[PDB]
């Protein structure tokens, strides 16, 4: 799938080590979903680690067209479903296995460099 991004619309404070506090108006990076109820969003601004945030506390959008999926109803299991299905977003389990196997020793490419923007 493509590097989709989600934006928090409500302040969701973490509860356990498997949860990450978020605020309304923040930028999070989606990694996977869970039964179309929970979404795996990570911090983009600050630096800490991946957590867990419900779809009812986030808004699926696109860095290319954030105004396209800005009207969508994440709450509606139907809408969120078509989105996750269309974009072909991986699930939590799939994400865990992917990262686990990806971290292991295998073929890869050293070439490649990425960085974060910075203005004002």
């Amino acid at each position: 799938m493509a590097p989709l991004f989600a934006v928090t619309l409500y302040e969701f404070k973490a509860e356990r080590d498997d949860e990450l506090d978020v605020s309304p108006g923040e930028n999070l990076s989606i990694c996977a979903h869970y039964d179309y109820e929970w979404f795996i969003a990570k911090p983009i601004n600050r630096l800490g680690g991946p957590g867990l945030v419900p779809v009812s506390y986030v808004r699926i959008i696109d860095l290319m067209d954030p105004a396209k999926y800005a009207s969508v109803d994440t709450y509606d299991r139907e809408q969120v479903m078509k989105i996750i299905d269309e974009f072909k977003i991986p699930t939590v389990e799939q994400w865990k296995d992917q990262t686990r196997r990806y971290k292991e020793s295998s073929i890869q490419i050293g070439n490649g460099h990425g960085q974060s923007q910075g203005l004002e």
Partner: peptide
Amino acid sequence: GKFIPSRPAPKPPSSA
């Protein structure tokens, strides 16, 4: 994985 959200799915701010 440590990412098993077995918790319930919360609803949006509305009068159900």
